[PDB]
Every structure is written in structure tokens, then in C-alpha cells.
Amino acid sequence: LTAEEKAAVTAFWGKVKVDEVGGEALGRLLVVYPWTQRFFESFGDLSTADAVMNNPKVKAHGKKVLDSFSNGMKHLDDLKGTFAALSELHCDKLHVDPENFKLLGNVLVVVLARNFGKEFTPVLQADFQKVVAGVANALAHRYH
């Protein structure tokens, strides 16, 4: 991330309602890519789309994923260390394939686009595609 790109992403992140966007992103990931429900079968009823999007534990875990995202937004020059602990949890303990990190990062982008519309310009999206790429890679660091 360049200084100008970093300044644009941080300013836009100030508008993001993390609680709504986080629950919607994790919910959409469970609906569009249903094999991810395997890791959240403890959350209860995921049998239909409306159940997933209104599941209270999915909205709660999504805020946690986007807070972790927000914590990474403060350390754009050290993603590998900010997520080093989380990378080992998802790898050695949760066994989440690293392909799903980019899948969730891409769903988040779609969620940001739906939630902000015309203000989510292609230039801004490209900057956010850099961040989700770096976050997904930092989470996959303890696999390699």
C-alpha cells in the first residue's frame, strides 16, 4: 500500500459500520460457499439463507472478524506479525484451508460495494483488493 492508497483506505474505513458489514460478510460467505459451514456448525441453524443471516452467532463472529480486520488496518506495514497468532489458530487448530481466506476477503469487498454503492469506486476497490490480499496472505503464513 502506497501512502496515497493507505490514506484513501483508512479514510473510507471510518465510514464502515463494522457490526453490520461483518455479520453480512460472514453470513454471505456461509450462504454462497456452503462448505464453510463445516467450521461453524456449532453456531446452530444454518439450514437456510435467512437462518444464516439472522443467526445471532454469525453476526457476532463477523464483528470479531472485521475487528481483526480493523486491527490489521492499523498495521499495514506488518500484517505477518499482526496475524501471526491468528494464522496458527486457523492452520494448526482449525485446519481452515487458506483458499477460504481470499474467499471471505472477496465477499467482504462485495459487501462493501453493496453497502456503499457509487462511493465504492473501482480505484478504491483496487486498494481494498490489495488489503484483503495482504490479510489473506498473512493468515496463510503459518501454512508455508
Binding site: 454471505r28 450462504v31 454462497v32 439463507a49 462485495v110 454503492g117 457509487k118 473501482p122 476497490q125 483496487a126
Partner: protein
């Protein structure tokens, strides 16, 4: 393959697109080039600046091909048989690139149709944009 409910969500979503198909298809390309610059190497002959007449025109061709696919959901291999030969044999497009264009299309549609871009429609359009990709990556 797409279910009956999948096909209905695709037909409904593309209906709300309407006369903005060519306009959304150009934006999806511009989003793909900006987010994934490796995809530019497939268009070295194109002017890729913002607002380019080439990018605008090709997006209309892409949108028209998607429109033909939505209207022929029961026979995607037949409706896109000519495009499958062009992409796999003539152009030899890396299949990972279709995932980038599909994602760019989903971002474009979600940005322009927020109230209609439900999780159910999101799941259907992703399943749809993946079938088109498989058809065009067939004949490999």
C-alpha cells in the same frame, strides 16, 4: 448445474440490469484491470485508460454474451460454443482469470443493485458466473 430457483434469481437480477448491461460490463472490466493488473496482459492492444472506447466497447460485447447466456440457461454449452473455442484455443486464457472477472461482475452488480443483491441472488449469480466460466474453459 443451475437449479430452477437459481435460474429465476439470475433472470430476475439481469432484468433489473436491463439497459445498463453494456454499462455494467464495461465497469466490471475496469474493476478487473484495476484490481488484477495481470489480466491486462490479455489486452495489450487495448487502450486501458479510464473511459477508454475499447474497454467500453468490449464490456458491451461481454454483457451481450452474458445476456445470451441468461436467455439460454438450459444450454450454456451450445449458446457459448463459439466463445469457448475463442477463449480456450485461440486466446488460451488462464482459468484463474475467469474467477477475477466473475468477482468484478459481482462487485459491479452489488454496487448498482443493493436492494436486489440478496444473499440468495448473490449465491445464484456466483453459481451462474461459474457455469459460464466452465463452459468457456471447456474444449481445453
Amino acid at each position: 448445474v443451475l437449479s430452477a430457483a437459481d435460474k429465476g434469481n439470475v433472470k430476475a437480477a439481469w432484468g433489473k440490469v436491463g439497459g445498463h448491461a453494456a454499462e455494467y460490463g464495461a465497469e466490471a472490466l475496469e474493476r478487473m484491470f484495476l484490481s488484477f493488473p495481470t489480466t491486462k496482459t490479455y489486452f495489450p492492444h487495448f487502450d486501458l485508460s479510464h473511459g477508454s472506447a475499447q474497454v467500453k466497447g468490449h464490456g458491451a460485447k461481454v454483457a451481450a454474451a452474458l445476456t445470451k447466456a441468461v436467455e439460454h440457461l438450459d444450454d450454456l454449452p451450445g449458446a457459448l460454443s463459439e466463445l469457448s473455442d475463442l477463449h480456450a484455443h485461440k486466446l488460451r486464457v488462464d482459468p484463474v482469470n475467469f474467477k477475477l472477472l466473475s468477482h468484478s461482475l459481482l462487485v459491479t452488480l452489488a454496487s448498482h443493485l443493493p436492494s436486489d443483491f440478496t444473499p440468495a441472488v448473490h449465491a445464484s449469480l456466483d453459481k451462474f458466473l461459474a457455469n459460464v466460466s466452465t463452459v468457456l474453459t471447456s474444449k481445453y
